[PDB]
Structures are given as structure tokens and as C-alpha cells.
Amino acid sequence: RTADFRTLERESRFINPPKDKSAFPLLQEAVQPHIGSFNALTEGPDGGLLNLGVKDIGEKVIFDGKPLNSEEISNSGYLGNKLSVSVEQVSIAKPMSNDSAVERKVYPSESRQRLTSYRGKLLLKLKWSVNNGEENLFEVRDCGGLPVMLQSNRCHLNKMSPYELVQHKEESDEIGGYFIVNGIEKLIRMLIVQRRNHPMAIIRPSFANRGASYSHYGIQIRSVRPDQTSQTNVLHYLNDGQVTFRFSWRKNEYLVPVVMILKALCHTSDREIFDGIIGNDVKDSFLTDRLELLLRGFKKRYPHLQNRTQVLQYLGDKFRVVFQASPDQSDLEVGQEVLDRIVLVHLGKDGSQDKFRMLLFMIRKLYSLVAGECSPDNPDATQHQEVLLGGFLYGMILKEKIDEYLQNIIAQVRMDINRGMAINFKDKRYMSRVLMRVNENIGSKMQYFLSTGNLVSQSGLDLQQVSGYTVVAEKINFYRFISHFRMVHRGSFFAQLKTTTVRKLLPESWGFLCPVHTPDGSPCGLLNHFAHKCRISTQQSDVSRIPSILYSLGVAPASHTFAAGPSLCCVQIDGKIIGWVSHEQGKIIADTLRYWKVEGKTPGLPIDLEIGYVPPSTRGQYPGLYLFGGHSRMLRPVRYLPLDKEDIVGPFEQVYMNIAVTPQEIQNNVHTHVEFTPTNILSILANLTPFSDFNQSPRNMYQCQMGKQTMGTPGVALCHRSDNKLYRLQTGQTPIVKANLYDDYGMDNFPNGFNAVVAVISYTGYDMDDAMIINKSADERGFGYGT
Amino acid sequence: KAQGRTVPIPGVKQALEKKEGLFRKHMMGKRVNYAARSVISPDPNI
Amino acid sequence: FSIPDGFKKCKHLKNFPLNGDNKQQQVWLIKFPSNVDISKLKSLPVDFESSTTMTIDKHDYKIMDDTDNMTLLVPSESKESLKIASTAPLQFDKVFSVSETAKIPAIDYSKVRVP
Amino acid sequence: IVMTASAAIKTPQMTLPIWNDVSDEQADTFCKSISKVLLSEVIDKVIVTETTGTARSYVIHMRFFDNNEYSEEYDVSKEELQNVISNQFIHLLEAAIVKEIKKQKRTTGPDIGVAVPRLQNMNKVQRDRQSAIISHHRFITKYNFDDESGKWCEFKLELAADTEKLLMVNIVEEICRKSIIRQIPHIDRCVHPEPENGKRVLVTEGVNFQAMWDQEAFIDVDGITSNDVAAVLKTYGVEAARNTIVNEINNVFSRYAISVSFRHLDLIADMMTRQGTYLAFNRQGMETSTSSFMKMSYE
Amino acid sequence: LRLTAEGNKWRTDILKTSVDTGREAAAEVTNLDKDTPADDPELLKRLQEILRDNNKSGILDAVTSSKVNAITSQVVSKCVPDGTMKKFPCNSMQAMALSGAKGSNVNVSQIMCLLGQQALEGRRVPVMVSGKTLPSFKPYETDAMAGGYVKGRFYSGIKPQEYYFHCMAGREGLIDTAVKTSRSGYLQRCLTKQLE
Amino acid sequence: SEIEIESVQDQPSVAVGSFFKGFRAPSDTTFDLYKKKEKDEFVLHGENERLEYEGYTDSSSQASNQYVVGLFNPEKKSIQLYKAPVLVSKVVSKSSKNLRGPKIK
Amino acid sequence: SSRHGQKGVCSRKWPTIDMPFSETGIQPDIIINPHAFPSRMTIGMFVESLAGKAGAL
Amino acid sequence: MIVPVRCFSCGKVVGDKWESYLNLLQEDELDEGTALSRLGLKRYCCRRMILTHVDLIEKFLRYNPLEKR
Amino acid sequence: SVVGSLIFCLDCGDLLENPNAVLGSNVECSQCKAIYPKSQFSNLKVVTTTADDAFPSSLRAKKSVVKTSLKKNELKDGATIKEKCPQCGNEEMNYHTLQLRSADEGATVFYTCTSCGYKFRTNN
Ligand SMILES: [Zn+2]
Ligand SMILES: [Zn+2]
Ligand SMILES: [Zn+2]
């Protein structure tokens, strides 16, 4: 008959911490993008991001300064003995303490009390290959203590039930997601980054002021490797009618003609490039001239480059120094190495045909933007972005440090061969001598990142900023603490801009980014907080079975069709252009896919899949069927009207989707979905605010900041802590007036206030606008007392 | 006005213009004796 | 060339009825999914324009027809392998494509929209 | 005003008081007569028919709006359009094509491997006219303009066999929005707003008093206001500039409904005009001050 | 904070005319005679032309805003104070606004009548490339609510669509307080040093 | 309108190979067909005095789509169906097999 | 502060004898000035007041 | 932490009524309201005191650095 | 195959050079030394139209079916509240709302008169 508080249930759970599944699953679902992100570093298919990362950094070559002595012109060309060093596997151990002999388990409570770091032993199988594997030497090298995330894959608490956690001096429903570094709990802040594997048509005045006769128009795709490392490729339209390919290696930008990078990927004719960009719209005079400028320009500048091999050799010759790929690597090898490491890396190696098709599509999208056929894509909008999770960022910098680690081994060998010469690479003694003369403490390097937030890297990753990647998981009260793990920042670089569009609350954020929960002043609209039911993608699956479903639904293969433009629908799966269809059929496929998606009868179509359909419009967004399944995606649950079942929606696909708020507001022929509860669009703290639909907008916002600054309960396991400073309310009380989500997050474990007899009265004369009166006899009785 | 040494030591010109300058920070404005600071509270009885 | 490995040359090739007289000849191209069996169906219902309906063992299909490069290679003889079709290059008279269509259910508004 | 005493104001304006004998239609026609007119504003379509024969032939057809349409919207005649194309536009177009040929032959392409900076049937009178224009232009062959109706302008451009491919439409487009039909110096647009406190006025988006002095039949030359202090000082003197400072500072406060006593503004203005010039409250204005200690404690 | 049964009837009746206003203004800027339906194919094509241009959208926003704000003014003029249950001097909320003790009749009207049109940077609510102002509303919806016009009051509560739109306009002010490089510190310092 | 089928051939016979827009060729050269043994992949190869033709089947398209070519009769209203694989064909020239030193300066 | 963004500093710790006393015999723990609400428009607190009282009884 | 001694508002002893309240909810199976009435809490200030009490002390006590396990 | 101003090979698909740059009566492909032309390729022409968005003007705006500009006075101030005018004494008075300063600070009201047209600024 009511929406009561659990009193009998609460007190029983306080005495008896459950031995089964922990209560309040939403609390663990809040730290799901943090724990999940770090879990994918070792566990999951393909052996985790860290094993994929060392598989992508590859070998590091150095040659011995010794002759061949063969009975010859070979002697002069002989570089010596080859030494290719790499890392096959990467291991992480749960925190242990050795005393030199037998190891003992070290729990988080110990690390906090000891004022030390909760580190796990980092191991990595080093490969010492000589003369291209004529003799291989393996050694599992201990690379220091890597700080491990709490309640994760490599934490001692992940299996533990509420009872076990209390017996191990932790909170009954301990969330985790943070790192204990020198006694300080530090977390990796989530970042808003460009949506992976999608060509974005952007107008930027910045592009013009860089080079000669450069326009505002351009295309930008953020290609991501399976190890989560990113590599952005940019297309520029010059006023000459020339198209240039922009990229980054080390920390320098490089420009190459697009017709050169196209001919390097696969053997094609000039007409194959023509058919690839210009479809049946051959009569478009605007396109007819622009493409002639590209093809004739390439023929004028490079008349010698007449085949795929010559192009690769010319590319290899000019990039042999920057890519450091030398001195036995041919210009054909270096050329291909450039392509495999720079051009559309999301499609990866053995997918040059796929890279060629995607590149032609980017040129057509670029020409549609110049003409005006296509409106520019907004990077600041939620639809054209994803969320770089902490664990993924941690894995990226780890991959960077192991690349540095291999570079250091070569540096030691280069020092050795440039002086005393020492001995050969086949001797294990020499390997052991080199290895202990190299700084192998990657754990300290990773401990530095978690202790300063400063990004020290040779590439600088695909990020703009270099600081503030890590923040102290402030436990002044639980409300502030739980909000940290739901907080997302656009970037430190964006905070120093006169643009207000970035800070503006947009409709694209509906159900993903909370409209209330944002700070006042400088972090307003920059330091956002996600919705309580919003989730972030940890990996992808069944993605390989979807092209088979699409081709069967009438999708004509891109390799046979040869027709491109905004006049036809382009079908893509994680940036992989698979085919071509009509815009009429394009929606039919998009609607029928969603139907078999929610139905548990189809094995190859996952419910978490994003079906981004873009209908054709008059000077609107570039049309197509851009499907997504990959990591970092923003996802939220909604009720799908036919079948009456749950459906997962992304911010890209939502823009054209008609989702009613309440079931009574469903309009015929113009609605496909409905919300479960409108409370799904707000944060945890925003939902906790009583009758927020009766308060003025900035007061609801200020409450989030207030509840964060309140002297409440920072925890109950304080007698085993040693934090800088803690604020504890002695007499905590359960709210009579409360949202039911207060119980769903078990906020009664950490009371933030007290129920007081409040009279709206002007009586004393000391209370006026910003001043309020407290009762003396109440204060004397311990009301609002804190320590 | 001196050659680069492998931040240099400030000269007497730098001492007079450290930030706002000696004239602005210690002549036009000064820290004073017989003064106090506190949070203000309202009172209708005074 | 000779490469790749595991590939054997096609010696025997079946006869193709190609004449192109004048009461005239027509060459058709059809696209089909891997789920349907071609040897099972002995009759295909097809009419002009995009409008088409087909049902083969619970599964529903639609035959998309379009007026309008692909090159047809017809075998002149089994020993002559394959050669480009010509009359005076050659193009298909009519091009068709079979697309699997699913019936999406109508929203039960009387059951979902509740005051 | 106060801090920089800028001679180059962001929005320089002129308030022109119109007489009573000049009607609302006459004043709007006058606004059009002074407003800067560009070739872009009268053109509807440009069709370039690039044909390569024998020589790159470029048939540029200028499809303008109807003669009565732009004459009622910009106060521009067909005769006015003829003079601009035959004297300015062709000379500007020829210079742009020559520059584009040089730019094509200069840099063949970007340097690979080298690092670039980071992101972050014709009449007799018509024939004599065409022949005279051919003698004044090095690349044109034909020039026919609609003299009766006044709707189009067609002209043929002949280029060498070595000139090869070129984007003429984009080249033409840029020169059209750069070509001025009629412009009164330093003035961009003259508009007719709602009468300010009962006063019939015209607000100019530029400053040139001597040009407005010639429009005595429309404007009361003894009441022509301007926000630009330096421009007022140059033409009307220090006391006029002084009066502009007290009025302009008052406009800044009156807009935000803030009342500041004129005793303050008059003092500020008198201090800025103490040297008979327009001095600002900064290092430059301060140079003429007796106290070196006051100067030392500023910067 | 309460209106009388008589006063609340007036509120619902004036706000009943606001549904037509959305399409009426949309039909005026687009230039269409006899007032074409909300689902008209030519009207929807005409509204798209407006969506792609910053100036054209401005004309649409300013016309629709002036028309819905006229409906707001009517509600407020009728319901306050002749429709309020408790009246001055006893209605303390009303008393504080009239006395000048704290608040105004504008705040009082948002509490007891309606929030009105949520204005963002001089215009209405921002609209997506799809022509949708929210995923809940129809693409190129010719309704006042879709544009940000809140019929709800803080006493009765505000709908989720209205809540999100209020969140936009509410934050918009705080964003301006964050992006305001203009300071009166140096301006005054330059005058005082020369005029001391 | 139900159209009847006379015969269906599941054996290799006739094939289709897409080149580019505006392909003529000498129309006297031969194309050697190849096969690999669930789904069979086909490879096309031709030779000329100045040119050379190479074709193959798309791995993602073969397992998902099955292409067929048929001959229609205007009076009998019967179609003779024959399975035809689509081969993505590229043409290499005499200019190919040209390269400089593996390492230059 | 209440859960409606109505923060205020403690102006004084008023004695219960000097505090206004209810018909029930209760004197408020906290006193909020009525002049806070017309500008902030925190009606959520107003409904929270009669809800909290109903739930306590 | 533990049940407060005396009601913050009036001063009526509430500390002796915490364990007795849980017994009226468990054994007697009464509702929240009737249980408080039987304890002698009629003022809503005294009513909320026990009704709204969390009792985090039982959660706090489970961490004892003086006894093993 | 010839398209617009572009001339492509039928055998390989390479873009053939302009007939004016190379030697007379005969043109040859760079890939294979193919025999061309046929003289039937003709003097190629391309009809390139203007962008239409390239010339933004007041007249181009008057050619738009939707309203592009507002009239001199045909735009009335909608928001009106009953408030005593401090200028002389009027009932009808316009208003504007915006949340200035911190999230703790109140809302500022911007009043406007209808009889004269005088702006205003007062928080409370
Ligand atoms: Zn009591
Ligand atoms: Zn050729
Ligand atoms: Zn007045």
C-alpha cells in the first residue's frame, strides 16, 4: 500500500553480511565500466588487450658488427648477425609478498595501513630471436609491481561475498574500481573521445591556417586497433582540388597525396578509383573536374609510379628514418609497415581491400561536404563520440612502456657493439648481461601515471592533453565517492577554450549524460556524469556472423556493385564497408535487424548491437547503415514496442529514433520505442533528489554538488584505514521522504544527513537569505554532531 | 640582458618588477598592523 | 601464375545455349541467399517492377527488379575455357535480386498505451 | 573608449538625421544608393562551359537577376553593371587565372617524409565595344552583354594548350564576391531603423563625413552624429570628440539601465582631451604626466 | 502557492489554445495559406529548409516565441492575483513579491501558472540534424512543447521533456558565468591611477 | 505470374567477372577457371600480348551469397538456370614487374 | 542544506525557551527564512515538508 | 551509530526504546506506526527519532582489531 | 571510355594524357603502349554550374519560399507582466529571465516598457 523503508531487513543485513550474491547489484553496475575495462586486459577472447598489444608492437632489430668471411660482394652487403627482440605473452599476478622464498597473500587493507601500493607482479615472456629464428631464446622477465585495480580480474576481493569482505577488513558491498598507490586511492578518469571507425565530415577554421590553399572542409576517422590503441587519419580538401592524407607518427604530423596511399593498398586502375568514388552520378560536373585534378596531378607529380610495388617503395624510401624500420628492411617492407601501422588500422593487416573501399567512401563524403550535399558532423555532440575507459587507457600506456622496454634492450646492445664489441647473441650469458643492464621496472612507470596523472609517451596516444588522467578517489562521503566512478570529462584541452557549444547540454545526451549532475563554475558542462542505467561496452562478439545476415537481407556486395554516393545507402559493420543498397531498402534492413535482435531466436545477432540508420535528407547528415558492436560504446535499455522486450540503444542511432517517455504519450505511426522509467535519464545523485520535478533547474544541480560536500558516512571500516582526512556524521538517519532508488543503491549503509523539524519562519531576525538558525537544545542533544 | 646559463637568477630590475612590482606590491599596497579578518554574521540588534 | 595451392584447373565445362537471333533472346541474372535450396525450387514467381512475393518453407522472400560494369563470360567450347560474350561486350537484358523479408509485428497499442 | 582610445573601432557608425521633406520611400532609396553593392549580390547563376579544341575555351555566362529586381533592391542600373564587368571584373579575373597557373607550376606537390606543423548576330555599337575590350585584355575573345533587357553577360576566354585543367567556377565565384559594383569609401551598409525618440535618422555601418556632406538634400549636415571618437576629432575638433566620449560612454550605461552622473563622464572626457588630442587611460596617454613615481608604480 | 478551482480552470483553458500556436507560427514563417496540417509533406520539406539555415531558424524561433509568450502573459494576467486561492495580504508568496522583500511576480507566475518558453542563447531549444528537439518528439514537430514551451508549473510539477529543456536553459546561465573574460578590474585600475 | 524452371546445373560451366566501367579487351583471349575443395572458391586467369587478367572470388560474399545466371524464352516462358561465381577481376599491364633497389641511400 | 539546494550558514544557536513553540509542544530543530523560497523556487522542499510530517505521524 | 539518548527536538528519552521497537516489528509483527505508539511516542518529533534511526554501530562492530577472524 | 573531360583506356583503365600535351595525330597509354585515337573522341566539353549558395544576398533571400527577414515593426514582444512603471505609471511591462552568478544566487529579471521602450535590470 506504500513505498516504505526496509527497517527489519536493513538491521538483519547489518549484523549478517550475505554469504551469497551481494545485495544492491546496481552499485556493482555503477563501477561496471571500470572493473570490466581492467578485466579485459588479461581475461576474455584473444588473450586480453595486453597480449594483443605486445603482438602489435612486434620485433625490434639490431645487427652485430661482424663480417661473413665467405669465399665476394655478399661480405660488403652483410649487416652481421640479426637480433629481433619482442614479447610473446604478458602475465599479471594477484598482490603477493615474498620473504625471497615462500609467497604470502597481501589484501587491500594491508596496503592502506602500510601506506604502500596494492601491486601485482608483472611478468612478460621476452623473445630473443637470432638471424630470423635460427635460434630463439625465451625468458620470463619480472618487470616490477604493477598497481592492480580493486574488485577486478587480478584483485583478491572479486570472488568474496559481503561476509568475506567484512572478514578481510573491507566494506560489505565494496565497489572497487580504484588503485591503492602509496596509501592514496586513485582512479583513472573516463574520457569523451571520437566514435571509433566512422568517417566524420568536419568544418574547422584550424585546418586552413596550417598549410597553403587549405579549406575548412575535411574528413576525420578515429581508427582503433584490437588492443584499444588509436590512430587518427585526416583527409584535407585543398582549394587546388587536391586531397591530402594527414596522420601522426612519434609526435610529428605528415602529409601524403590520397591517390598515393590508395595505389599502395592494392593494384588498381585510374578508372577503378573513378568508379569507387563516383557511382552512377557520372554526370555530376562538380565531381568530374575534382577527380580529374587528383588523377592528372598524381600522373604529373609521380609519372614513374606505375605499379603498387613502386608506390610502396617510394613511400618506404621517404619514411625509412621516422618509422625507424631499418637497415635490412626493404622499401617495400617499410612501405607496407607504414600502411599496416597508419592507414585505417581498425580494418587491420590482411584487409587492404577493405581499407581501399573505406578510403574511397571518405573522398566521396569529403566532396559531398564541399558541394553542400552533406551537413558537417558535430564532434562536440554525444552521437559522434564514445568513452575511453580507465582500464583501456591503462593498457595503452602499458603497451607504450613495453615498446620503450624493447627499445632500451636494443639501446644497450647498440652501446655494446659501438665499443668493446663483447660477444654473440646466441650466448644466453650475454642476453642475461644485457637484460640486467636495462631498467625493467615498468611497475614504477605505471605507478607514476597513477600517482601524477601525467602521460609520458613517445606517440602521445591519440589524445590532446598530457596531464590529469588520474584523480584521487575522494571519500569525504559515499555520494562523492560513487559519483567519481560515473563522472566523465571531455578533456583538459577543451577546458581552455572560449567556445560555449562544448559546455551546452544537448538532446543527443538524453539517457546517456545526466542533464542535472554537472558542477557550477569552471567545470560546468565539461565534467559530466552518466545516467544511472547507462552502460559502456567492454568488448564485441558475433560481429563476424552479421555480414552473412546482411547479405541475405538483400545487401549487394561492395566488391561487385561499384557505385558510391549519398544517392545510395552504404552498409558498414564497425567501419567495415560490406555492401550497397537503396535508401528505401536501407530502412527495411535496419528495422528487420532490430526485430531479430530483441528476439532470442537468432544466434548471430547480439542485443547490445548498435544499428545506426541515417535516412536521406536535403543538405543533412551523410546517409548510410553504420552498424556498431565494438568497445567503449554508450548503451542504454529501452522497451521495444513490438514483442514488448528490452532493447539496447546508442547515442548515434537514437538521433533518428522515436522513443516515447511515458506509455500514455505513444503516438501511432511515429513511435517505435518507449522508456522503462524516465528516471533512466538522470544520474544516481540526481535521482536521489526528492521531488526534483518541482524544483527550479539550478537548485537540482546545486544539490548534487551539496550532497558531494556533505559530512556524512565515508565508510564503516575506518579502524583499518589511514586517509589524509575523513568527515564522519555521528547520528545518521534514514530519509522518510526518498526516491526508491536510495534503497537500490543501499545508501542506508552510508547516511548523508538527518530528519529535522524545520519551520519556514522569520522570527529570530538573525535568519535572512543565506543565514539559517539551529536549535541550541537540539545541538546540546547531539543534533548534527560530526568528527 | 645576460647570456643563457645551462631559470636564471633575477637581477635588480627583476627584483623591482618580480610580479606586479615592488611599487605595486609593497608601496601602493601593504600588509598592515592592528587589523583582523573574520566571517561576517548578520545582527539586527546592533 | 600457377598459384595458389589446392586449386585445380577446370577442364570439363557444360554447354551454354547462346545464339542471339533477331521472337528474341533474353539473358537474366539472379541473386540468391545460401539458406535457400535452388535444386528444391522448380518454379519461381516473378512479375515486372519491384513488387514480388515468395514463400519457401516458412521463410519469406522478395525478388527486387532493376533496369540498370559487370562482364559476362560464356564458354564457346570445353577446351576453349571461357571467353567474353559479344554480338556486335554484352549486357544482361533483365537483372533480379532475391532479398529475405521478415514480417515485423504491428504494435498492440490497446495493450501498450495504458492511461 | 577609456582603455584604448581606438581609431579603429569594431563597429564604426554614423547617425544621419533625415529632413521632413524626404519621405520614407525616398530615404529607403537613399539607403540603397549609399550601401556597398557587390557583383555577387546581382548574380543568380554562372555557367562555365570548359571546351578544349584546336586551346582551352571558357564560355562564362553570367545569369543575373531580372533588371527591375536588382534596380529596386540595390539601386543599380544595367549601365552600372556593364562598366564594372568591362573595366574591373575581367582585369581581376585575368590576374587570378595567371596567379593560379604560376601556383600550379611552382609547387608540384607536398613534401613526403618531411614533418608539417601540427593541427592544435551582333550590333555595330556592340562590335566597337568588344574590339576595344579585346585590345585592353590579353585572354578574352568574345564579350556580349544584354543591353536591351539587361539579364545576362556572356564572354569567351582563350587559354594556351600548356594551361591544361583548371577549376574556373571556383575562380569566378571568389572574384564576383570581391568585385564591387558601387561603394562609397569607408562605408559598407546604410540602414533605416525605427525613429529614435521621435528623431528621423539613418544608421551607417561606416564613417566618411565629407561624402555625407554632398547629400545636403537628404541629410542635416549640422546634426550628423558618429560613434567613432577619433574620426569626429579629425573633422570637427577636440570639443566635438569630447562630446562624443560623454555621449558614447552614456550609451553603454543607459542600455543596461544604469544611471551614472554626467559630472563623472565630463571629468573623464576632459582628462582624455586635456592635451587637445584623444588620450586613453594606458601607458601611452600617461607619457605626458609630471610624476615619474606615479608612472613607476603603474608599469 | 495554490490557485482556486475557478483560477485553475482559467489556466487550463488559456493553455488549451497553445497547442494550435506551435503549428500556426510554423505555417506563418513557412508562408502557407488556409493553415496547412501538421503532417503536410510540403510543410515538412519547407521546415527542413529552415533547419539547415541559422538565420531561417532564427525567424521561426522569434515568431513562435512571441506567439507562445503572448499565451503565457494571458495566463499570468488572468490567474494572478484574481485566480489565486489565498490572496494578499495573507498570501505571503504574493506579499514578498509585491513588498519588494524578496522575489518578483515573474517567479510567482512560474510557481503558480507556468515556466513558459525556455529561451536558449536568444532562441528556442537546440534541434538535432534529424529535425528532432528530443528522441521523444516527432521529426519537424510543429508543437510549442517540442520547441521548449513549458505549460507545467513548479507547484504541479514539470514533465520529463520540459525538465530536460529547463535543465538546458538553467545551465545556460551558469555557462555564461564560466565563459566571461570581461573584467572591470583593469578598466578601473587604469582610470584611478591617472585620476587619483 | 509464376515462371517455370526447366533445368538447374550445380556443376561449373558459365562464370561472370566484373572489371570496370568501359572494358572491351581483344575478344580472342581465353580465361582459365580454377576451383578449390562447404563452399568452393574460384580463381580466373587470362593472358595477352600486352596485358594480363587476374580474378578471384570474395571470401565474405561466397559463403553468404549464391549467384545464378539463366536464359529466358519469349514463347515457352521457361528459364534454364546455371550457377555462376562472381570474380573480382583486375588487369595488370606490361609496365608491371618494375622496381628499384630494396634500399636506396 | 536540505536536499533541494537551499544552503545557509549557521547565524546563531537559538535557545529552546527563546525558540517558537508549536501547539504540539515541539520547537523546530532548524529555522529556514521564508524569503529564501520566492527567488530559488525550491517547491520540492515545500512538498518534502508535508510528506516528511505525514510519514513521521 | 547507536540510538540517541533523548529526542533532539523536545528531549524525551528514546535510547531505551530501540531494541524494544525491533521486537514489536519481529515477534509482534506490527506495522511501523502502531509499534511507535505502544512505545509511548505520539509527537512526530519523537516518532521520527526511532523510526528514522539507522543503527550503523552493528555494521561498525563487525571490524574488531582485538579478536582473530 | 570517355567521360566529360577525362579519357580512360578500354584495356587497362588508365587515364590517358591530354591530346594537346603529347605528339600530334597519335596518343598512347603509359601502362601498355596502346594504339589511340580514333578522332571520333571529339572536342570534349563540360557544363559546370555555380554552387547557388556561392552568392548569398538580400535578393537571393527573397527568392526563398520561407521567410528570411522580419519586417520593420511586424514583431511584437510576447512576454508581459502586470507591474507599476517607475517612469510615469503603466500596467503592461515586458520581462526576461536568465540565471546569472553561482548556482546559490537567485534569478535576475530584465523589465522593458511598452509606452516609451526603456530597458531595466533588478534581481529583487
Ligand atoms: Zn520529541
Ligand atoms: Zn592503357
Ligand atoms: Zn512609461
Swiss-Prot record, chain C:
<comment type="subunit">
    <text>Component of the RNA polymerase I (Pol I) complex consisting of 14 subunits: RPA135, RPA190, RPC40, RPA14, RPB5, RPO26, RPA43, RPB8, RPA12, RPB10, RPC19, RPC10, RPA49 and RPA34. The complex is composed of a horseshoe-shaped core containing ten subunits (RPA135, RPA190, RPB5, RPO26, RPB8, RPB10, RPC10, RPA12, RPC19 and RPC40) where RPA135 and RPA190 form the DNA-binding cleft. Outside of the core, RPA14 and RPA43 form the stalk that mediates interactions with transcription initiation factors and newly synthesized RNA.</text>
</comment>
<comment type="similarity">
    <text>Belongs to the eukaryotic RPA34 RNA polymerase subunit family.</text>
</comment>
<protein>
    <recommendedName>
        <fullName>DNA-directed RNA polymerase I subunit RPA34</fullName>
    </recommendedName>
</protein>
<comment type="function">
    <text>DNA-dependent RNA polymerases catalyze the transcription of DNA into RNA using the four ribonucleoside triphosphates as substrates. Component of RNA polymerase I (Pol I) which synthesizes ribosomal RNA precursors. Besides, RNA polymerase I has intrinsic RNA cleavage activity. The heterodimer formed by RPA34 and RPA49 stimulates transcript elongation by Pol I.</text>
</comment>
<feature type="modified residue" description="Phosphoserine">
    <location>
        <position position="34"/>
    </location>
</feature>
Curated annotation (Swiss-Prot), chain E:
<comment type="subunit">
    <text>Component of the RNA polymerase I (Pol I) complex consisting of 14 subunits: RPA135, RPA190, RPC40, RPA14, RPB5, RPO26, RPA43, RPB8, RPA12, RPB10, RPC19, RPC10, RPA49 and RPA34. The complex is composed of a horseshoe-shaped core containing ten subunits (RPA135, RPA190, RPB5, RPO26, RPB8, RPB10, RPC10, RPA12, RPC19 and RPC40) where RPA135 and RPA190 form the DNA-binding cleft. Outside of the core, RPA14 and RPA43 form the stalk that mediates interactions with transcription initiation factors and newly synthesized RNA.</text>
</comment>
<protein>
    <recommendedName>
        <fullName>DNA-directed RNA polymerase I subunit RPA190</fullName>
    </recommendedName>
</protein>
<feature type="modified residue" description="Phosphoserine">
    <location>
        <position position="57"/>
    </location>
</feature>
<comment type="function">
    <text>DNA-dependent RNA polymerases catalyze the transcription of DNA into RNA using the four ribonucleoside triphosphates as substrates. Component of RNA polymerase I (Pol I) which synthesizes ribosomal RNA precursors. Besides, RNA polymerase I has intrinsic RNA cleavage activity. RPA190 and RPA135 both contribute to the polymerase catalytic activity and together form the Pol I active center. In addition, subunit RPA12 contributes a catalytic zinc ribbon that is required for RNA cleavage by Pol I.</text>
</comment>
<feature type="region of interest" description="Bridging helix">
    <location>
        <begin position="160"/>
        <end position="172"/>
    </location>
</feature>
<comment type="similarity">
    <text>Belongs to the RNA polymerase beta' chain family.</text>
</comment>
UniProtKB/Swiss-Prot annotation, chain G:
<protein>
    <recommendedName>
        <fullName>DNA-directed RNA polymerase I subunit RPA135</fullName>
    </recommendedName>
</protein>
<comment type="subunit">
    <text>Component of the RNA polymerase I (Pol I) complex consisting of 14 subunits: RPA135, RPA190, RPC40, RPA14, RPB5, RPO26, RPA43, RPB8, RPA12, RPB10, RPC19, RPC10, RPA49 and RPA34. The complex is composed of a horseshoe-shaped core containing ten subunits (RPA135, RPA190, RPB5, RPO26, RPB8, RPB10, RPC10, RPA12, RPC19 and RPC40) where RPA135 and RPA190 form the DNA-binding cleft. Outside of the core, RPA14 and RPA43 form the stalk that mediates interactions with transcription initiation factors and newly synthesized RNA.</text>
</comment>
<comment type="function">
    <text>DNA-dependent RNA polymerases catalyze the transcription of DNA into RNA using the four ribonucleoside triphosphates as substrates. Component of RNA polymerase I (Pol I) which synthesizes ribosomal RNA precursors. Besides, RNA polymerase I has intrinsic RNA cleavage activity. RPA190 and RPA135 both contribute to the polymerase catalytic activity and together form the Pol I active center. In addition, subunit RPA12 contributes a catalytic zinc ribbon that is required for RNA cleavage by Pol I.</text>
</comment>
<comment type="similarity">
    <text>Belongs to the RNA polymerase beta chain family.</text>
</comment>
From Swiss-Prot, chain I:
<keyword id="KW-0862">Zinc</keyword>
<feature type="binding site">
    <location>
        <position position="29"/>
    </location>
    <ligand>
        <name>Zn(2+) 1</name>
    </ligand>
</feature>
<feature type="binding site">
    <location>
        <position position="85"/>
    </location>
    <ligand>
        <name>Zn(2+) 2</name>
    </ligand>
</feature>
<dbReference type="GO" id="GO:0003899">
    <property type="term" value="F:DNA-directed RNA polymerase activity"/>
</dbReference>
<feature type="binding site">
    <location>
        <position position="113"/>
    </location>
    <ligand>
        <name>Zn(2+) 2</name>
    </ligand>
</feature>
<feature type="binding site">
    <location>
        <position position="12"/>
    </location>
    <ligand>
        <name>Zn(2+) 1</name>
    </ligand>
</feature>
<dbReference type="GO" id="GO:0006362">
    <property type="term" value="P:transcription elongation by RNA polymerase I"/>
</dbReference>
<keyword id="KW-0240">DNA-directed RNA polymerase</keyword>
<feature type="binding site">
    <location>
        <position position="9"/>
    </location>
    <ligand>
        <name>Zn(2+) 1</name>
    </ligand>
</feature>
<dbReference type="GO" id="GO:0042790">
    <property type="term" value="P:nucleolar large rRNA transcription by RNA polymerase I"/>
</dbReference>
<comment type="subunit">
    <text>Component of the RNA polymerase I (Pol I) complex consisting of 14 subunits: RPA135, RPA190, RPC40, RPA14, RPB5, RPO26, RPA43, RPB8, RPA12, RPB10, RPC19, RPC10, RPA49 and RPA34. The complex is composed of a horseshoe-shaped core containing ten subunits (RPA135, RPA190, RPB5, RPO26, RPB8, RPB10, RPC10, RPA12, RPC19 and RPC40) where RPA135 and RPA190 form the DNA-binding cleft. Outside of the core, RPA14 and RPA43 form the stalk that mediates interactions with transcription initiation factors and newly synthesized RNA. Interacts with RPA2/RPA135.</text>
</comment>
<keyword id="KW-0479">Metal-binding</keyword>
